[PDB]
Design a protein around this nucleic acid. Structure first.
Ligand SMILES: [Mg+2]
Ligand SMILES: [Mg+2]
Ligand SMILES: [Mg+2]
Ligand SMILES: [Mg+2]
Ligand SMILES: [Mg+2]
Ligand SMILES: [Mg+2]
Ligand SMILES: [Mg+2]
Ligand SMILES: [Mg+2]
Ligand SMILES: [Mg+2]
Ligand SMILES: [Mg+2]
Ligand SMILES: [Mg+2]
Ligand SMILES: [Mg+2]
Ligand SMILES: [Mg+2]
Ligand SMILES: [Mg+2]
Ligand SMILES: [Mg+2]
Ligand SMILES: [Mg+2]
Ligand SMILES: [Mg+2]
Ligand SMILES: [Mg+2]
Ligand SMILES: [Mg+2]
Ligand SMILES: [Mg+2]
Ligand SMILES: [Mg+2]
Ligand SMILES: [Mg+2]
Ligand SMILES: [Mg+2]
Ligand SMILES: [Mg+2]
Ligand SMILES: [Mg+2]
Ligand SMILES: [Mg+2]
Ligand SMILES: [Mg+2]
Ligand SMILES: [Mg+2]
Ligand SMILES: [Mg+2]
Ligand SMILES: [Mg+2]
Ligand SMILES: [Mg+2]
Ligand SMILES: [Mg+2]
Ligand SMILES: [Mg+2]
Ligand SMILES: [Mg+2]
Lengths: 70, 63, 206, 143, 145, 141, 63, 53, 56
RNA sequence: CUUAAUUGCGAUAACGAACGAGACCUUAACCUACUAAAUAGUGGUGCUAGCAUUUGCUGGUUAUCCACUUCUUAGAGGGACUAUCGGUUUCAAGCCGAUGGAAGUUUGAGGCAAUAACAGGUCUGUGAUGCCCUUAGACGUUCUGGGCCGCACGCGCGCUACACUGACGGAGCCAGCGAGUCUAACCUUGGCCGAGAGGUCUUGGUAAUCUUGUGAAACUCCGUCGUGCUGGGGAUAGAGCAUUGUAAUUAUUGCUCUUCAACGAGGAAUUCCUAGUAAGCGCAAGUCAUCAGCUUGCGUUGAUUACGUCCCUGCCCUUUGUACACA
RNA sequence: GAGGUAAAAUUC
């Protein structure tokens, strides 16, 4: 299975819709379900954390835990 | 697990048969008295003799 | 909790909940019981622990193995297969994220799931190999309540390692997937399947 | 209220001291930066690729103040690591000597480090002025 | 950081120096598929042409691809201190030359040709396809392929 | 003079000398406070004589602990032994005995080797094996 | 399937070829006047509540 | 433990324990010439060194 | 001079071991039984402890 | 019957003894007590630097000036003896459980270790040696060169790996057992030069002093990497810079660039191990002018699973069978 | 006064 490391306009709209629907999001969640690369999935977490869509309850270098906005 | 040897039971038989006065069933008065009245080379075998005389002084007043 | 000023700065998150009742960093060691049989001195809870790291002497005595906390025993079983012998600070961190993933999905008090994972993944009857000669026949014998704790921790850390092998999902992610499926057994994990397979063979051998 | 560098944590101080000297500009690079491995036991150059000379210099300037005096050979044994030598297992290899000297030559013209007597290098009165002022700025930001 | 949103002008596998380049990966490994240069040489060229290492292959403007080739064809004039090249003190003219894609296959043959025509022991061992760096061939080397 | 007691806590090779002198209640480990323990996981192990005994209980004395020898886990279990042993020392010679047994029974049901040393020592290595009990391997033919 | 609990009141000893099966006389919790000897596998102390898959099964000696 | 190479690989260890003392004595030189000819003992080294400068 | 004590005390044992075999081979016909050495300044004493000292 | 034990309690044509076991010794653990320490440390007083300034906090400085021995060192000693208590066997030897205690598996681990025996190994440890051979164009000795490293193939002990519990880049920074130069060139601090390897100028230490706090690795943090024989793997091969040595070609070895293969958890079989042990990890020492990937010690991180049985391999004690005694 | 139990295994 190929993973897209470069975003598309039709793929960028899919990220803003399906991520706050999810209960648990992480690095392994975005690679397996949204079919993006592992190096690209780390950058997308900081893009959603800065805007305030996802909420970190625990931050670590190896494992990243993020929940939805309450 | 642990069984005493014969030389512990040999010296303990020699103590009880002649030192029934000046010794009671307490260990601490059976330990510091063997420092002078007997010539034991090491502390470890000395405590094993006094640990076995104390075991036998308990079962004299019983039977 | 009657706060007071002090020279070295200890934060508010430490002095508030850790001085009134003996809970975790900011988590729960609350009134969670067992939904199975009693299992006397097999569940550690009351008395609780601070973290999963402990240098106790629980392996010297045959009886005091059940006195070890099961949160520590999950760090102990994630500490094998070669390169991971030692490195317990890696193993406590995996359990630290394992309780975080459980705490999200329907808010799911995480100490309830770990205790229920032990009671719903233990094979209730085992088989032993004795007699026969040449072509030996297996005999189905009962199992101790100690080994039902011992096999539950083994079947939830080996299958969480093979599911996290050669894929994007990490160790603490697949381990939480094993424990949530262990609460409601639907043959969707490793230990729920291997519990049922060891009992459907034990039926033909008794 | 009184503050020192030991009251400040290990890596928040380094990430703030190296960020403060980035704005000052007084760096005095020799010129063989960005092409060096900075060790004889590593495998790749550092991944920062723009700067990263302040990052070791922030670690050295704190390493001197917490001790009596250190030299070049002390910064080579600590900052080194195990070398991936190949089919036979690892061995402790000291770090590069030329990197650890030019940091102590760049911090000397500023006034932070000084040539200590009886060997080694100690901290100066300007080093205790600068490294203790911004150490207060780390704790005041987080409260 | 930031995700690019301009258009579908992303350019994968495209070839330079007649050997193919692995597309849609980090730009520091675009050059590593070339036989003759390595990971250390690919990182040095991408730091001299003002190329961001936090990107993929990406856009690959034609003004940027020509500067990468210009460094690789003239390494001794573009701030390389000559201890980094692979072929130093050459047997042809004594200069410092850096091998290329289809060049390292030809120069390795020329390094084996000048040793077989002089009957030296460093070259005759390559004629039977054996080990030349002087180790025990008692147990190891039993595959031939 | 000022009231000053001193104790020690011992793991395998890590000793933690804890001078408990008078002051206004500061806890420093090698000049750095107790909030800066080198493992982030094992930081709550040295907090265990800071939670069970009471919130502060430090109205008159300071804590100053230094480390000699050990590792990264062996020194964490030495400084938390030095505080619990260095607390019952001050509550003996100055504070009355009746309030010290409240501290002793507190670290009795939760024993966890705080007011008692760990006598487990590494076994010496014998010949033939890379470890103490182990052996390399043997081949029959 | 039904579940049946049983409390350990007496233990006999090890019985088997390799020595891993213990003869344990368990007493049911739903019937305090009836007991059945069962063969178990792991470490069993007294007063332990076990889970029996088959209620009625008499244990024999393994050879 | 073996002189040849045959047998089980049994190793053999030895040890020699060296004990050392030093005593500072602010003494006149008259008792120095007496303390050297007295308290002699085989296997014991006696050293007299110059002062702090 | 100037020998470390981890080597001088070892060399004193070699000095005793070297004189063990020579006073065994030379004093074989005189009933040799072992020697002891006593080092003192200005006079080093080596005691020859044998059975028959008139032949020695 | 009871133990690790021919251990003992006892039973008895045997009674009293000699060996082994045990004892003893060494080491690791405990003592806020003893004798003491500028070659081991702390507290206080002076001088002095920085931060807050209301008294503080963190450091520096060697005969300023005194006190102390808690750690560390080790002389003499103390201390568990299965002690106390509750059960169990007919009492008795002993076992099991709890409490106390630094420690209750023989306290943990070693050293020593009988009788009888082997056609076990070493004549290549020996100026320990019988006999035989050789004794000068020498199977004495010495110098130059080569070999012991050659190789379609089989086996044994080990090392690195088949990664995302990981590689890679910064940063956190933690030990013990050790070893080191006299009529010389050992361990090396510090300052310069060099990408590295290293080079150079000096200094400390014949050693609890200096190297050395061997600020070692695994590890911990912060990032990159995202499953693709990839950035896992570093074999093979080219070119160059240096060190050791009279001499390195068959690359001694170190370093830098480049080459970047097999290997996707290993068939039949088989080895080691029960607690601070297994495993992971590095250091020191031995051999050493130079080189371990070996070995002898040591420390750091530290499990899972038994507390049993004689099923397999095999060992002790009796009873019995034998046509075996080269068993 | 009652209390488990059979594979194959040849020669020097
Ligand atoms: Mg298992
Ligand atoms: Mg497993
Ligand atoms: Mg993955
Ligand atoms: Mg340089
Ligand atoms: Mg191209
Ligand atoms: Mg890269
Ligand atoms: Mg050939
Ligand atoms: Mg070959
Ligand atoms: Mg080679
Ligand atoms: Mg305890
Ligand atoms: Mg060891
Ligand atoms: Mg072997
Ligand atoms: Mg002894
Ligand atoms: Mg003392
Ligand atoms: Mg024998
Ligand atoms: Mg031999
Ligand atoms: Mg030989
Ligand atoms: Mg010989
Ligand atoms: Mg002739
Ligand atoms: Mg002739
Ligand atoms: Mg002639
Ligand atoms: Mg010649
Ligand atoms: Mg040769
Ligand atoms: Mg990765
Ligand atoms: Mg790392
Ligand atoms: Mg650190
Ligand atoms: Mg000198
Ligand atoms: Mg020392
Ligand atoms: Mg350190
Ligand atoms: Mg760390
Ligand atoms: Mg085999
Ligand atoms: Mg080594
Ligand atoms: Mg060596
Ligand atoms: Mg056993």
């Amino acid at each position: 299975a190929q993973h897209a490391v470069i975003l598309d306009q039709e793929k960028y709209d899919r990220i803003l819709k399906e991520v706050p629907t999810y209960r648990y999001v992480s690095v392994s969640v975005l690679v397996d379900r949204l079919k993006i690369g592992g190096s690209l999935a780390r950058i997308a977490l900081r893009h959603l954390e800065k805007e305030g869509i996802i909420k970190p309850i625990s931050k670590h270098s190896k494992q990243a835990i993020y929940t939805r906005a309450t | 697990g642990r069984v005493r040897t014969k030389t512990v039971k040999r010296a303990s038989k020699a103590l009880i048969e002649r030192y029934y006065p000046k010794l009671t069933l307490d260990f601490q008065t059976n330990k510091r008295l063997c420092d002078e009245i007997a010539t034991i080379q090491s502390k470890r075998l000395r405590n094993k003799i006094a640990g076995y005389t104390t075991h036998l002084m308990k079962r004299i007043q019983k039977g | 909790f009657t706060p007071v000023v002090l020279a070295t700065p200890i934060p508010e998150e430490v002095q508030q909940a850790q001085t009134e009742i003996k809970l975790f960093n900011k988590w729960s060691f609350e009134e969670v019981e067992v939904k199975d049989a009693s299992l006397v001195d097999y569940v550690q809870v009351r008395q609780p622990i601070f973290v999963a790291h402990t240098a106790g002497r629980y392996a010297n005595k045959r009886f005091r193995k059940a006195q070890c906390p099961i949160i520590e025993r999950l760090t102990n079983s994630l500490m094998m297969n070669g390169r991971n012998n030692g490195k317990k600070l890696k193993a406590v961190r995996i359990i630290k994220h394992t309780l975080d993933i459980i705490n999200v999905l329907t808010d799911q008090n995480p100490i309830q799931v770990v205790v229920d994972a032990i009671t719903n993944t233990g094979p209730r009857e085992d088989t032993t190999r004795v007699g026969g000669g040449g072509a030996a026949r297996r005999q189905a014998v009962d199992v101790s309540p100690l080994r039902r704790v011992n096999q539950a921790i083994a079947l939830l850390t080996i299958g969480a390692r093979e599911a996290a092998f050669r894929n994007i999902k990490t160790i603490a992610e697949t381990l939480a997937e094993e424990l949530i499926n262990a609460a409601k057994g639907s043959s969707t994990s490793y230990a729920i399947k291997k519990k049922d397979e060891l009992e459907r063979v034990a039926k033909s051998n008794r | 209220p009184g503050v020192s560098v030991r009251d400040v944590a290990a890596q928040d101080f380094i990430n703030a001291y190296a960020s403060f000297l980035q704005r000052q500009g007084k760096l005095e690079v020799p010129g063989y930066v960005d092409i060096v491995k900075t060790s004889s036991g590593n495998e790749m150059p550092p991944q920062d690729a723009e700067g990263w000379f302040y990052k070791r210099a922030a670690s050295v300037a704190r390493h001197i103040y917490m001790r009596k005096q250190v030299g070049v050979g002390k910064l080579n044994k600590l900052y080194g690591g195990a070398k991936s030598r190949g089919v036979r297992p690892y061995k402790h290899i000291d770090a590069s000597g030329s990197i650890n000297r030019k940091v102590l030559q760049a911090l000397e013209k500023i006034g932070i480090v000084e040539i200590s007597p009886k060997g080694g290098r100690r901290i100066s009165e300007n080093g205790q002025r600068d490294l203790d002022r911004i150490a207060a700025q780390t704790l005041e930001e987080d409260e | 950081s930031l995700v690019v949103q301009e258009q579908g002008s992303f350019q994968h596998i495209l070839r330079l120096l007649n050997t193919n380049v692995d597309g849609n990966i980090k730009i520091v490994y675009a050059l590593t598929t070339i036989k003759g240069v390595g990971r250390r040489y690919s990182n040095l060229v991408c730091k001299k042409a003002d190329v961001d290492l936090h990107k993929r292959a990406g856009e690959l403007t034609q003004e940027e691809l020509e500067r990468i080739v210009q460094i690789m064809q003239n390494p001794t004039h573009y701030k390389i201190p000559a201890w980094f090249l692979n072929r130093q003190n050459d047997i042809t003219d004594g200069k410092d030359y850096h091998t290329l894609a289809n060049n390292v296959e030809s120069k390795l043959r020329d390094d084996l040709e000048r040793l077989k025509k002089i009957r030296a022991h460093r070259g005759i061992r390559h004629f039977w396809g054996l080990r030349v760096r002087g180790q025990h061939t008692k147990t190891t080397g039993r595959r031939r392929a | 003079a000022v009231p000053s007691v001193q104790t020690f806590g011992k793991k395998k090779s890590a000793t933690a000398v804890a001078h408990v002198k008078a002051g206004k209640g500061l806890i420093k480990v090698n000049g750095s406070p107790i909030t800066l323990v080198e493992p982030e996981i094992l930081r709550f192990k040295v907090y265990e004589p800071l939670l069970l005994v009471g919130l502060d209980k430090f109205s008159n004395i300071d804590i100053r602990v230094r480390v000699t020898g050990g590792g990264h886990v062996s020194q964490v279990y030495a400084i938390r032994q030095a505080i619990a042993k260095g607390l019952v020392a001050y509550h003996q010679k100055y504070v009355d005995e009746q309030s010290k047994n409240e501290l002793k029974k507190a670290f009795t049901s939760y024993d966890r080797t705080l007011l008692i040393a760990d006598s487990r020592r590494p076994e010496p290595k014998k010949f033939g094996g890379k470890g103490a009990r182990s052996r390399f391997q043997k081949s029959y033919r | 399937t039904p579940v049946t609990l049983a409390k350990v009141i007496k233990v006999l000893g090890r019985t088997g070829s390799r020595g891993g099966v213990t003869q344990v006389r368990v007493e049911f919790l739903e019937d305090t006047s009836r007991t059945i000897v069962r063969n178990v596998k792991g470490p069993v102390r007294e007063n332990d509540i076990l889970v029996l898959m088959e209620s009625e099964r008499e244990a024999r000696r393994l050879r | 433990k073996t002189p040849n190479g045959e047998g089980s690989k049994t190793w053999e260890t030895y040890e020699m324990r060296i004990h050392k003392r030093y005593i500072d004595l602010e003494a006149p030189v008259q008792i120095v010439k007496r303390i050297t000819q007295i308290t002699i003992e085989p296997g014991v080294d006696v050293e007299v060194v110059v002062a702090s400068n | 001079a100037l020998i470390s004590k981890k080597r001088k005390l070892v060399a004193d044992g070699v000095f005793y071991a070297e004189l063990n075999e020579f006073f065994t081979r030379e004093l074989a016909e005189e009933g040799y039984s072992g020697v002891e050495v006593r080092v003192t300044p200005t006079k080093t004493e080596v005691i020859i402890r044998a059975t028959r000292t008139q032949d020695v």
